[PDB]
CSV table of C-alpha atoms and ligand atoms in Angstrom, one decimal:
chain,number,residue,atom,x,y,z
A,1,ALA,CA,-20.6,-24.8,12.2
A,2,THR,CA,-21.2,-21.2,9.6
A,3,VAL,CA,-18.5,-18.7,9.6
A,4,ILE,CA,-18.2,-15.5,6.9
A,5,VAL,CA,-14.7,-14.0,6.1
A,6,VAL,CA,-15.0,-10.9,5.2
A,7,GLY,CA,-11.7,-9.6,2.6
A,8,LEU,CA,-10.6,-11.9,0.7
A,9,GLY,CA,-6.5,-10.7,0.5
A,10,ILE,CA,-4.7,-13.0,1.2
A,11,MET,CA,-5.7,-13.2,4.8
A,12,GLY,CA,-9.1,-13.7,4.0
A,13,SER,CA,-8.4,-16.0,1.4
A,14,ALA,CA,-5.9,-18.3,3.8
A,15,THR,CA,-8.6,-18.1,6.5
A,16,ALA,CA,-11.3,-19.3,4.2
A,17,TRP,CA,-8.6,-22.3,3.6
A,18,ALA,CA,-7.9,-22.7,7.4
A,19,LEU,CA,-11.9,-23.4,8.2
A,20,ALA,CA,-13.0,-25.0,5.0
A,21,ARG,CA,-9.8,-28.3,6.2
A,22,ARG,CA,-11.2,-28.5,9.2
A,23,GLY,CA,-14.6,-29.1,7.6
A,24,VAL,CA,-16.7,-25.7,8.6
A,25,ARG,CA,-18.9,-24.3,6.1
A,26,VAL,CA,-17.7,-20.6,5.0
A,27,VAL,CA,-19.1,-18.3,2.7
A,28,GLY,CA,-15.8,-15.3,2.2
A,29,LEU,CA,-17.4,-12.0,1.5
A,30,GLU,CA,-15.1,-9.6,-1.1
A,31,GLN,CA,-15.7,-6.2,-2.4
A,32,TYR,CA,-13.5,-6.1,-5.6
A,33,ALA,CA,-12.8,-8.9,-8.2
A,34,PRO,CA,-10.4,-11.7,-7.7
A,35,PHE,CA,-7.0,-11.4,-7.2
A,36,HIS,CA,-7.1,-7.5,-7.8
A,37,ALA,CA,-4.6,-5.1,-7.4
A,38,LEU,CA,-6.1,-1.9,-5.1
A,39,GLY,CA,-5.0,-3.8,-1.7
A,40,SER,CA,-2.1,-4.9,-0.7
A,41,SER,CA,-1.7,-8.8,-1.3
A,42,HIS,CA,-1.2,-8.2,-5.5
A,43,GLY,CA,1.8,-8.5,-6.8
A,44,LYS,CA,3.7,-12.1,-8.2
A,45,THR,CA,6.4,-12.4,-5.7
A,46,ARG,CA,6.7,-11.5,-1.8
A,47,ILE,CA,9.9,-12.5,0.5
A,48,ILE,CA,9.4,-15.0,3.5
A,49,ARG,CA,12.6,-14.8,5.5
A,50,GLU,CA,13.3,-16.7,8.9
A,51,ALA,CA,15.9,-15.2,11.0
A,52,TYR,CA,13.1,-12.2,11.6
A,53,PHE,CA,15.0,-8.8,12.5
A,54,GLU,CA,11.7,-7.3,13.5
A,55,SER,CA,11.0,-9.6,16.7
A,56,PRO,CA,12.2,-13.6,17.9
A,57,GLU,CA,9.0,-13.8,18.8
A,58,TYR,CA,7.6,-14.3,15.0
A,59,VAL,CA,10.3,-17.0,14.2
A,60,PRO,CA,8.3,-20.1,15.9
A,61,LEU,CA,5.1,-18.2,13.7
A,62,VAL,CA,7.0,-18.3,10.4
A,63,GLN,CA,7.8,-21.3,11.0
A,64,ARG,CA,4.7,-23.0,11.3
A,65,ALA,CA,4.1,-20.4,8.2
A,66,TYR,CA,6.7,-22.3,6.3
A,67,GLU,CA,5.3,-25.8,7.2
A,68,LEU,CA,1.8,-24.5,5.8
A,69,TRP,CA,3.0,-23.3,2.6
A,70,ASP,CA,4.6,-26.8,1.7
A,71,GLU,CA,1.0,-28.2,2.7
A,72,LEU,CA,-1.1,-25.7,0.6
A,73,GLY,CA,2.1,-26.6,-2.9
A,74,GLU,CA,1.2,-29.9,-1.9
A,75,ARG,CA,-2.3,-30.0,-2.1
A,76,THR,CA,-2.9,-27.5,-5.2
A,77,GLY,CA,0.1,-28.5,-6.8
A,78,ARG,CA,0.7,-25.3,-7.6
A,79,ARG,CA,4.6,-24.0,-7.5
A,80,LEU,CA,4.2,-21.4,-4.2
A,81,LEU,CA,8.4,-20.8,-2.8
A,82,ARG,CA,11.7,-21.1,-4.3
A,83,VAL,CA,14.5,-20.8,-1.3
A,84,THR,CA,16.8,-18.2,-2.4
A,85,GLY,CA,18.6,-17.4,0.9
A,86,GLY,CA,18.9,-13.9,1.9
A,87,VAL,CA,21.0,-11.4,2.4
A,88,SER,CA,20.4,-7.9,5.0
A,89,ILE,CA,22.2,-4.8,4.2
A,90,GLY,CA,23.5,-2.5,6.7
A,91,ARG,CA,25.9,-0.9,9.2
A,92,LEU,CA,26.9,-3.3,12.1
A,93,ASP,CA,24.5,-1.9,14.4
A,94,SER,CA,21.7,-1.8,12.2
A,95,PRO,CA,18.2,-3.2,13.6
A,96,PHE,CA,18.2,-5.3,10.1
A,97,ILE,CA,21.6,-7.0,11.4
A,98,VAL,CA,21.4,-6.6,14.9
A,99,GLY,CA,17.8,-7.8,14.9
A,100,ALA,CA,18.9,-10.7,12.6
A,101,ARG,CA,21.0,-12.2,14.7
A,102,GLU,CA,19.2,-11.9,17.9
A,103,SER,CA,16.8,-13.8,16.2
A,104,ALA,CA,18.8,-16.4,14.7
A,105,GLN,CA,20.9,-16.7,17.9
A,106,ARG,CA,17.5,-17.3,19.9
A,107,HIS,CA,16.8,-20.2,17.4
A,108,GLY,CA,19.7,-22.0,17.0
A,109,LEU,CA,19.5,-20.7,13.1
A,110,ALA,CA,22.4,-20.6,10.9
A,111,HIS,CA,23.6,-17.4,9.8
A,112,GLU,CA,26.9,-15.8,8.4
A,113,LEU,CA,28.2,-12.0,9.2
A,114,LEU,CA,30.4,-10.4,6.4
A,115,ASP,CA,32.2,-7.3,6.2
A,116,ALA,CA,32.5,-5.3,3.1
A,117,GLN,CA,35.3,-6.9,1.7
A,118,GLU,CA,33.9,-10.2,2.0
A,119,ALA,CA,30.0,-9.6,1.1
A,120,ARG,CA,31.6,-7.6,-2.3
A,121,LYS,CA,33.4,-11.2,-2.9
A,122,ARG,CA,30.6,-13.7,-2.6
A,123,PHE,CA,27.8,-11.2,-3.6
A,124,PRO,CA,29.3,-9.1,-6.2
A,125,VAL,CA,26.6,-7.7,-8.2
A,126,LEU,CA,26.1,-5.4,-4.4
A,127,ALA,CA,28.2,-2.5,-3.6
A,128,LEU,CA,28.3,-1.7,-0.3
A,129,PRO,CA,29.9,0.9,1.5
A,130,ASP,CA,33.0,0.0,3.5
A,131,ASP,CA,31.4,0.4,6.8
A,132,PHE,CA,28.8,-1.8,5.8
A,133,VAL,CA,27.9,-5.9,6.9
A,134,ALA,CA,26.2,-8.6,5.3
A,135,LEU,CA,23.9,-10.8,7.2
A,136,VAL,CA,23.0,-14.1,5.3
A,137,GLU,CA,20.4,-16.9,6.0
A,138,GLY,CA,19.8,-19.8,4.3
A,139,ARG,CA,16.1,-20.3,4.4
A,140,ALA,CA,14.8,-17.4,2.9
A,141,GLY,CA,13.4,-16.7,-0.6
A,142,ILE,CA,10.4,-16.1,-2.8
A,143,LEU,CA,6.8,-16.6,-2.4
A,144,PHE,CA,5.0,-16.4,-5.8
A,145,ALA,CA,2.3,-14.5,-3.8
A,146,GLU,CA,-0.3,-14.6,-6.5
A,147,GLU,CA,0.0,-17.9,-6.8
A,148,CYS,CA,-0.2,-18.7,-3.1
A,149,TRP,CA,-3.3,-16.5,-3.2
A,150,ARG,CA,-5.0,-18.5,-5.4
A,151,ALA,CA,-4.2,-21.8,-4.1
A,152,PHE,CA,-5.9,-21.0,-0.8
A,153,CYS,CA,-8.9,-20.1,-2.6
A,154,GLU,CA,-8.9,-23.3,-5.0
A,155,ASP,CA,-8.0,-25.5,-1.7
A,156,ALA,CA,-10.8,-23.9,0.0
A,157,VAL,CA,-13.4,-24.3,-2.7
A,158,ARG,CA,-12.0,-28.1,-2.8
A,159,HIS,CA,-13.0,-28.2,0.4
A,160,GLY,CA,-16.9,-26.7,0.3
A,161,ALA,CA,-16.3,-22.8,1.0
A,162,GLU,CA,-18.3,-19.9,-1.0
A,163,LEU,CA,-16.2,-16.9,-2.3
A,164,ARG,CA,-18.3,-14.3,-3.9
A,165,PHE,CA,-16.3,-11.4,-4.8
A,166,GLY,CA,-18.3,-7.8,-6.0
A,167,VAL,CA,-20.0,-7.7,-2.4
A,168,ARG,CA,-19.3,-5.0,0.0
A,169,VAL,CA,-19.9,-5.5,3.7
A,170,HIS,CA,-20.8,-2.6,5.3
A,171,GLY,CA,-21.5,-4.1,8.5
A,172,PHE,CA,-22.6,-6.8,11.5
A,173,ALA,CA,-23.9,-7.6,14.6
A,174,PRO,CA,-25.0,-9.9,16.9
A,175,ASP,CA,-28.2,-12.0,16.1
A,176,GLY,CA,-28.9,-14.4,19.2
A,177,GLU,CA,-28.1,-17.3,16.9
A,178,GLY,CA,-25.1,-15.8,15.8
A,179,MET,CA,-24.4,-12.9,13.6
A,180,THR,CA,-26.4,-11.4,11.0
A,181,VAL,CA,-23.8,-9.5,8.4
A,182,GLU,CA,-24.8,-6.5,6.5
A,183,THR,CA,-24.0,-6.2,2.3
A,184,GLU,CA,-24.7,-3.3,-0.3
A,185,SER,CA,-26.9,-6.4,-1.5
A,186,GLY,CA,-29.1,-8.2,1.4
A,187,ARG,CA,-27.8,-10.1,4.3
A,188,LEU,CA,-26.1,-13.0,5.2
A,189,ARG,CA,-26.2,-15.3,8.5
A,190,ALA,CA,-23.4,-17.2,10.5
A,191,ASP,CA,-22.0,-18.1,13.2
A,192,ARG,CA,-19.1,-16.5,13.7
A,193,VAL,CA,-17.4,-13.4,11.5
A,194,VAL,CA,-13.4,-12.9,10.5
A,195,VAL,CA,-12.6,-9.5,9.8
A,196,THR,CA,-9.3,-9.4,6.9
A,197,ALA,CA,-10.0,-6.2,5.8
A,198,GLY,CA,-6.3,-5.1,4.8
A,199,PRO,CA,-6.5,-1.0,5.0
A,200,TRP,CA,-10.0,-0.6,4.9
A,201,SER,CA,-10.0,-1.6,8.4
A,202,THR,CA,-10.8,1.6,9.9
A,203,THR,CA,-13.9,1.7,8.3
A,204,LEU,CA,-15.7,-1.4,8.4
A,205,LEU,CA,-14.3,-1.6,12.4
A,206,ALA,CA,-14.5,2.4,12.9
A,207,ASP,CA,-16.1,2.1,16.2
A,208,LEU,CA,-13.0,0.2,17.6
A,209,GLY,CA,-10.8,3.1,17.3
A,210,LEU,CA,-7.7,0.6,15.8
A,211,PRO,CA,-4.6,2.6,15.8
A,212,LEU,CA,-3.8,2.1,11.7
A,213,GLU,CA,-2.0,4.3,9.2
A,214,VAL,CA,-2.3,3.7,5.5
A,215,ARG,CA,0.6,4.1,3.4
A,216,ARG,CA,1.0,4.1,-0.3
A,217,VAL,CA,4.6,2.4,-1.6
A,218,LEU,CA,6.3,2.1,-4.4
A,219,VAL,CA,7.9,-1.0,-6.9
A,220,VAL,CA,9.9,-0.8,-9.9
A,221,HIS,CA,10.7,-3.5,-11.8
A,222,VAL,CA,13.8,-2.6,-14.2
A,223,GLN,CA,15.7,-4.8,-16.7
A,224,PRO,CA,19.2,-5.6,-16.4
A,225,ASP,CA,21.7,-5.4,-19.5
A,226,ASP,CA,23.5,-8.1,-17.9
A,227,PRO,CA,20.3,-10.8,-17.0
A,228,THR,CA,22.2,-13.6,-15.8
A,229,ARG,CA,24.7,-11.6,-13.3
A,230,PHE,CA,21.5,-11.0,-11.2
A,231,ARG,CA,20.0,-14.4,-10.7
A,232,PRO,CA,18.5,-16.3,-8.0
A,233,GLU,CA,22.0,-19.0,-8.0
A,234,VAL,CA,23.9,-15.7,-7.4
A,235,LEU,CA,21.5,-13.2,-6.1
A,236,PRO,CA,19.3,-14.1,-2.8
A,237,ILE,CA,16.7,-12.0,-1.9
A,238,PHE,CA,17.4,-8.5,-0.4
A,239,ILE,CA,16.9,-6.1,2.2
A,240,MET,CA,19.1,-2.8,2.6
A,241,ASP,CA,18.7,0.2,5.2
A,242,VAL,CA,21.1,2.6,4.1
A,243,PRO,CA,21.5,6.4,4.4
A,244,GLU,CA,18.3,6.8,1.4
A,245,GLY,CA,15.9,4.8,3.3
A,246,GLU,CA,14.8,0.8,3.4
A,247,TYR,CA,15.0,-1.1,0.1
A,248,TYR,CA,14.1,-4.6,-0.7
A,249,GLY,CA,14.8,-6.5,-3.8
A,250,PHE,CA,14.6,-10.3,-5.4
A,251,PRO,CA,17.0,-11.6,-8.2
A,252,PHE,CA,15.9,-11.6,-11.6
A,253,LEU,CA,13.2,-13.4,-13.1
A,254,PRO,CA,11.6,-14.3,-16.7
A,255,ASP,CA,9.0,-11.7,-17.1
A,256,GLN,CA,9.0,-9.4,-13.9
A,257,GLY,CA,13.5,-8.2,-14.1
A,258,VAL,CA,14.6,-7.6,-10.8
A,259,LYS,CA,12.1,-5.8,-9.0
A,260,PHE,CA,12.9,-3.2,-6.1
A,261,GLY,CA,10.6,-1.3,-3.3
A,262,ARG,CA,10.9,1.2,-0.7
A,263,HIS,CA,10.0,0.1,2.2
A,264,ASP,CA,10.5,3.1,4.6
A,265,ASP,CA,8.2,6.2,4.4
A,266,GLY,CA,6.0,6.9,1.5
A,267,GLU,CA,2.6,9.1,1.5
A,268,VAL,CA,-0.3,8.6,4.3
A,269,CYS,CA,-3.2,7.9,2.7
A,270,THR,CA,-6.8,6.5,2.6
A,271,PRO,CA,-8.0,3.4,-0.2
A,272,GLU,CA,-9.6,6.3,-1.4
A,273,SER,CA,-7.9,9.0,-1.8
A,274,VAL,CA,-4.1,6.9,-2.9
A,275,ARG,CA,-2.3,8.2,-6.3
A,276,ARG,CA,-2.0,5.4,-8.5
A,277,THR,CA,0.2,7.5,-10.8
A,278,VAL,CA,4.3,7.0,-10.1
A,279,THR,CA,5.5,10.1,-11.5
A,280,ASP,CA,8.9,10.3,-13.3
A,281,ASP,CA,11.1,12.0,-10.1
A,282,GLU,CA,9.8,8.8,-8.3
A,283,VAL,CA,11.4,6.8,-10.8
A,284,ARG,CA,14.2,8.5,-10.7
A,285,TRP,CA,14.2,8.1,-7.2
A,286,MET,CA,14.1,4.7,-7.3
A,287,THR,CA,16.4,3.7,-10.0
A,288,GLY,CA,18.8,5.8,-8.5
A,289,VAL,CA,19.1,4.1,-5.1
A,290,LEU,CA,19.0,1.3,-6.5
A,291,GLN,CA,22.0,2.1,-9.1
A,292,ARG,CA,24.1,2.8,-6.4
A,293,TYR,CA,23.7,-0.3,-4.7
A,294,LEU,CA,23.3,-2.7,-7.5
A,295,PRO,CA,25.1,-1.2,-10.6
A,296,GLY,CA,23.7,-2.3,-13.8
A,297,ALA,CA,20.6,-3.3,-12.4
A,298,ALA,CA,18.3,-0.7,-14.4
A,299,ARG,CA,19.1,-0.4,-18.2
A,300,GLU,CA,15.6,0.1,-18.6
A,301,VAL,CA,12.5,0.9,-16.6
A,302,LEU,CA,9.7,-1.9,-17.8
A,303,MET,CA,7.1,-1.8,-14.9
A,304,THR,CA,6.1,0.5,-11.8
A,305,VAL,CA,3.5,-0.6,-9.2
A,306,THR,CA,1.6,1.0,-5.9
A,307,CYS,CA,0.5,-0.7,-3.4
A,308,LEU,CA,-0.5,-0.1,0.1
A,309,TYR,CA,0.6,-0.6,4.3
A,310,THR,CA,-1.4,-0.5,6.8
A,311,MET,CA,0.4,0.2,10.0
A,312,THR,CA,0.1,-0.1,13.8
A,313,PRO,CA,2.4,2.1,16.2
A,314,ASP,CA,4.9,-0.6,17.1
A,315,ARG,CA,4.7,-2.2,13.1
A,316,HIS,CA,3.6,-5.8,14.9
A,317,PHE,CA,0.2,-7.1,13.8
A,318,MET,CA,-2.6,-7.0,15.4
A,319,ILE,CA,-4.6,-10.0,15.8
A,320,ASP,CA,-7.5,-10.7,18.5
A,321,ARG,CA,-11.3,-10.9,19.2
A,322,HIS,CA,-13.8,-8.2,19.2
A,323,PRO,CA,-13.5,-6.4,22.6
A,324,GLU,CA,-17.3,-6.7,22.9
A,325,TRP,CA,-18.7,-9.8,20.6
A,326,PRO,CA,-16.4,-12.8,21.1
A,327,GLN,CA,-18.4,-14.3,18.0
A,328,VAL,CA,-15.9,-11.6,15.9
A,329,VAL,CA,-12.5,-11.8,15.7
A,330,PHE,CA,-10.2,-9.9,13.2
A,331,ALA,CA,-6.3,-9.1,11.8
A,332,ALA,CA,-5.2,-6.2,10.5
A,333,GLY,CA,-1.8,-3.9,10.7
A,334,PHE,CA,0.5,-5.9,8.9
A,335,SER,CA,3.2,-3.1,8.5
A,336,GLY,CA,4.2,-4.2,5.5
A,337,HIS,CA,5.5,-7.5,6.2
A,338,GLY,CA,2.4,-10.0,7.4
A,339,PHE,CA,2.0,-12.3,3.4
A,340,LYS,CA,4.6,-14.7,4.8
A,341,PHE,CA,2.5,-15.5,8.0
A,342,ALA,CA,-0.9,-15.5,6.1
A,343,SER,CA,-0.9,-19.3,6.0
A,344,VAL,CA,-0.2,-19.2,10.1
A,345,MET,CA,-2.5,-16.3,10.2
A,346,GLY,CA,-5.5,-18.1,8.9
A,347,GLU,CA,-4.6,-21.2,11.2
A,348,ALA,CA,-4.8,-18.7,14.1
A,349,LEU,CA,-8.4,-16.9,13.2
A,350,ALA,CA,-10.0,-19.7,12.6
A,351,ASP,CA,-8.6,-21.0,15.9
A,352,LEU,CA,-9.7,-18.1,17.1
A,353,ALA,CA,-13.4,-18.0,15.3
A,354,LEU,CA,-14.1,-21.6,16.4
A,355,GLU,CA,-12.5,-22.0,19.9
A,356,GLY,CA,-11.8,-18.9,21.1
A,357,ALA,CA,-8.4,-19.4,21.7
A,358,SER,CA,-5.4,-20.8,20.2
A,359,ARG,CA,-2.2,-22.9,20.4
A,360,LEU,CA,-0.4,-20.4,18.4
A,361,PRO,CA,2.1,-18.2,20.7
A,362,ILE,CA,0.3,-15.1,19.2
A,363,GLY,CA,-0.5,-13.0,22.6
A,364,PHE,CA,2.3,-10.9,22.1
A,365,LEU,CA,0.7,-9.7,18.4
A,366,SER,CA,-2.8,-9.3,20.9
A,367,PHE,CA,-5.0,-6.0,21.3
A,368,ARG,CA,-2.8,-5.6,25.1
A,369,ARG,CA,0.2,-4.4,24.0
A,370,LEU,CA,-0.9,-1.2,22.9
A,371,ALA,CA,-3.4,-0.2,25.8
A,372,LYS,CA,-2.7,3.0,27.7
B,401,FAD,C1,4.6,-3.5,-2.7
B,401,FAD,C2,4.1,-4.2,-1.1
B,401,FAD,C3,5.3,-4.9,-0.7
B,401,FAD,C4,5.2,-6.2,0.4
B,401,FAD,N1,6.1,-6.9,0.7
B,401,FAD,C5,6.1,-8.2,1.4
B,401,FAD,C6,6.9,-9.0,1.8
B,401,FAD,O1,7.6,-8.8,0.6
B,401,FAD,N2,6.9,-10.3,2.3
B,401,FAD,C7,5.6,-10.2,3.3
B,401,FAD,O2,5.4,-10.6,4.6
B,401,FAD,N3,4.9,-8.8,3.4
B,401,FAD,C8,5.0,-8.0,2.2
B,401,FAD,N4,4.1,-6.8,2.2
B,401,FAD,C9,2.8,-7.1,3.2
B,401,FAD,C10,1.7,-7.9,2.4
B,401,FAD,O3,1.7,-8.3,1.3
B,401,FAD,C11,0.4,-7.3,3.1
B,401,FAD,O4,0.6,-7.4,4.6
B,401,FAD,C12,-0.6,-8.5,3.5
B,401,FAD,O5,-1.0,-8.3,2.0
B,401,FAD,C13,-2.0,-8.3,4.2
B,401,FAD,O6,-3.1,-8.5,3.7
B,401,FAD,P1,-4.6,-8.5,3.6
B,401,FAD,O7,-5.5,-9.3,3.2
B,401,FAD,O8,-4.2,-7.5,5.6
B,401,FAD,O9,-4.8,-7.4,3.0
B,401,FAD,P2,-5.3,-7.1,1.7
B,401,FAD,O10,-5.3,-7.6,0.3
B,401,FAD,O11,-5.4,-5.3,1.7
B,401,FAD,O12,-6.7,-7.5,1.6
B,401,FAD,C14,-8.4,-6.9,2.1
B,401,FAD,C15,-9.2,-7.2,1.8
B,401,FAD,O13,-10.7,-6.7,2.2
B,401,FAD,C16,-11.0,-6.2,1.1
B,401,FAD,N5,-12.5,-5.2,2.0
B,401,FAD,C17,-12.0,-4.4,2.7
B,401,FAD,N6,-13.2,-4.4,3.2
B,401,FAD,C18,-14.3,-4.6,2.9
B,401,FAD,C19,-15.7,-4.8,3.1
B,401,FAD,N7,-16.3,-3.6,3.4
B,401,FAD,N8,-16.7,-5.6,2.8
B,401,FAD,C20,-15.6,-7.0,1.6
B,401,FAD,N9,-14.8,-6.1,1.2
B,401,FAD,C21,-13.6,-6.0,2.1
B,401,FAD,C22,-10.5,-5.4,0.6
B,401,FAD,O14,-10.9,-5.4,-0.8
B,401,FAD,C23,-9.2,-6.4,0.3
B,401,FAD,O15,-9.5,-7.0,-0.9
B,401,FAD,C24,4.0,-6.3,0.8
B,401,FAD,C25,3.0,-5.4,0.6
B,401,FAD,C26,3.4,-4.4,-0.1
B,401,FAD,C27,2.5,-3.4,-0.6
B,402,CL,CL1,13.1,-24.3,-3.4
B,403,CL,CL1,23.2,-17.8,0.1
B,404,CL,CL1,-28.8,-16.6,5.2
B,405,CL,CL1,26.3,-4.3,-17.0
B,406,CL,CL1,3.9,0.2,-15.1
B,407,CL,CL1,0.7,-4.6,5.4
B,408,CL,CL1,-14.5,-10.8,23.4
């Protein structure tokens, strides 16, 4: 079998890995350089969580994603995951809290709800309002994202994959014996095509009318004056639903400081129009929010970063076959929370491309729930 994978962000790289491991001939095509920072996959760390507030239907998928991250780590010898536990902060009726409890109960997962007093005792680095609660889980942690991105490409190449960078795909069409893919430089042919185009999905897949909106979001890295009180042993990954917005962060790590980002809002843009400049007022806002809930974390700003999310209307992913051409499958619309699922999305895409179907429980992420 031959497959072409369009886009070598995390999802395309995972898909090239899952196909090559099956003995499938795979050629990946990516418009920019390897492990570039213009899409959604870049950075040294991402959060993985198991008691999943967005919907309990993700729990069996993230559980398989954990198993596949472990297999990837074993085969490549790269260190990919650090389980730290995770804490979610919010009012008792915040979706972060409600949804994680629902997911955990439904899947039998260990978790602990703490009131503000108990949370301050357990995690004194957090400064919470008296009416907030914390929900703690054990299996959450840090994916070393760039290590994972490189791992997939190394192990795919070990299994025969070819990966091409600096090649922009203009389109594709069935040719009677598979698909022909048109690039800015020539044509390539395969039995099947997988599209994992990230924020560029409505360009390449324009004629499908996917309901996707690209958002610019910001991350800051700060240096505490007392780093040791921010280290993983005392500060798990965290997420917070607060009056200033939804935010997330990581414990202090060497050469990263404390990383803090904002999940909600963020400007609607396209990858062409996105503002890469991060303004002084943007920096001051982020450090102002971080200092309210984690006082002493931002003695110095180390770095600021822009990145892109691709949102669906319901914030659930889209993975499905092309509605006209069964030789083509695609995943898009990861809505700011897909990186942790990349290993299992590569599995699912390889199943949809080779077999037309998957035993993974990805039905709820198809086109159907979005139909009129
Ligand atoms: C700041 C930030 C923090 C995040 N935090 C988390 C987190 O903690 N945990 C989590 O699970 N998720 C997180 N995410 C979300 C996650 O990183 C994304 O969902 C995931 O990266 C999407 O991967 P992708 O491969 O779809 O997209 P992308 O990485 O953007 O890849 C698409 C690739 O397709 C290429 N391309 C597009 N069109 C063409 C074409 N015509 N021809 C050739 N190449 C093409 C692009 O150049 C790009 O390399 C975060 C995202 C951001 C921005
Ligand atoms: Cl670990
Ligand atoms: Cl913990
Ligand atoms: Cl050819
Ligand atoms: Cl301090
Ligand atoms: Cl910077
Ligand atoms: Cl995204
Ligand atoms: Cl189809």
